[PDB]
Amino acid sequence: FLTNTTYDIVNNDTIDVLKMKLRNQGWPFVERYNAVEIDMSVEPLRSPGQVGRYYNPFNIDPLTKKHVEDRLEEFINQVQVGRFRNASGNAVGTTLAAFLR
């Protein structure tokens, strides 16, 4: 969508090659973010207790009370001012940025 290519052209490209193509065009969201494990305990009551762990939803760290990526605000501003399909698209960066916020 953003680099003006087709699936067949980029079929054999690796992840690092794909990351370079998007980053040069101005797209920063090219990384997976690990979730934060939240430790959980069930009080015993009649039965013996259980201890478990689960991922905090939406990749939000409870300690920082924010998303794991510390450059998210800078990344969204980068998309807002970016130009992606100048010849065949209009306001792609602004529309995508508004959705991200």
């Binding site: 430790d39 305990s41 009080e43 207790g49 201890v51």
Partner: protein, 299 residues
């Protein structure tokens, strides 16, 4: 001439050359962080009269839920930490921990493997050599405080040469009676009780008069780069624990009374700059070991 040297400086055995990369350094830091949570949870269990905080922390440390009738030892994490500690001490100790196990355990908690963030002060006194004339006797005892007893039986005053090495930063010399000390080819000063010395200044000459023996007490301080989580009290307690459990019982190795003696002895050997890096990781590992065993005891 007669030569006397400190006992703990003699023949430092080579340290291990394994588990010193970034991945292994992360595993040791992770183990230390998780061991601290284990000891705090056990305190919380005592105050809350509930085993939930301790079971909660033991599961993260050992990847297993504690079950009755089975002894709590720390799981696979304890097995890796104990065997890695042995490898750090001596090069003759085997390396038996796979790389897959180190990588898995290092991913349990997020932490840096940096071992040069901060510094610590070590008080072992390096006396590399004391050279004395024929008619004099010199005896050196002690490591934290070194007492050098000198007796002169000759007709005239004798000169004793003191070599404190090049690694220690400052050395403070206190005498039972006032005495004269000066550097090589320097006029002797008036008799004084105390001397503050820089070991890099060179060999030091002490005038030993004929008569009652003169005893010189030496204290030294040196700076070694350590991680911020380093705690000297915890490291020393772990060193004695590792000795009692017999993890340091390896062939052709030298035994030290304290971790302060061990790190200074390795520093003064050849290629000591490379040895001291391995010793720092061992100290952090011993801190994790000390906290792990105190949380999970065996009679």
């Amino acid at each position: 001439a007669n030569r006397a040297t400190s006992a703990f400086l003699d023949n430092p055995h080579p340290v291990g050359v394994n588990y010193v990369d970034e991945g292994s350094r992360q595993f040791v830091a992770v183990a230390e962080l998780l061991a601290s949570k284990l000891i705090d949870s056990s305190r919380e269990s005592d105050e809350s009269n509930s085993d939930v905080p301790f079971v909660q922390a033991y599961s993260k440390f050992a990847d297993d839920n504690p079950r009755h009738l089975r002894v709590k030892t720390g799981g696979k994490m304890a097995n890796a930490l104990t065997n890695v500690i042995r490898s750090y001490y001596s090069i003759n100790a085997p390396a038996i921990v796979p790389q897959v196990e180190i990588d898995r355990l290092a991913s349990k908690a997020t932490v840096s493997g940096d071992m040069y963030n901060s510094y610590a002060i070590f008080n072992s006194v390096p006396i590399v050599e004391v050279l004395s004339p024929a008619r004099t006797t010199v005896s050196i005892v002690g490591s934290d405080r070194a007492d050098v007893t000198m007796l002169n039986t000759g007709a005239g005053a004798a000169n004793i040469t003191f070599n404190f090495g090049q690694i220690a930063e400052t050395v403070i010399l206190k005498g039972s009676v006032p005495f004269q000390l000066a550097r090589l080819n320097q006029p002797m000063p008036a008799a004084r009780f105390t001397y503050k010395l820089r070991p890099l200044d060179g060999p030091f000459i002490v005038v030993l008069p004929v008569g009652n023996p003169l005893v010189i007490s030496a204290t030294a301080a040196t700076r070694i780069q350590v991680p911020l989580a380093f705690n000297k009290a915890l490291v020393e307690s772990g060193f004695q624990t590792a000795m009692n459990d017999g993890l340091f019982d390896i062939q052709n190795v030298n035994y030290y009374s304290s971790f302060d003696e061990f790190i200074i002895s390795q520093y003064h050997a050849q290629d000591g700059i490379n040895r001291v890096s391995t010793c720092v990781i061992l100290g952090l590992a011993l801190q994790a070991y000390d906290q792990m065993r105190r949380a999970l005891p065996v009679r």
